[PDB]
Amino acid sequence: GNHWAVGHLM
């Protein structure tokens, strides 16, 4: 679906 919380790596 939507990419709400994805890819939170600095």
Distance CA 4, CA 8 (A): 11
Q: How far does Cα 9 stand from its chain's mean position?
A: 9
Distance CA 6, CA 4 (A): 6
Residue with tokens 């990419």, as numbered in its chain: 3
Distance CA 1, CA 10 (A): 23
Residue 4's region, left for phi above 0, alpha for psi from -120 to 50, else beta, is alpha
Technique employed here was: NMR
Residue with tokens 């600095």, as numbered in its chain: 10
Q: DSSP state, 8? A: -
Distance CA 7, CA 3 (A): 9
Residue with tokens 């709400």, as numbered in its chain: 4
Longest CA pairwise span in the chain (Å): 23
The beta strands (E) that lie in the chain are given as none
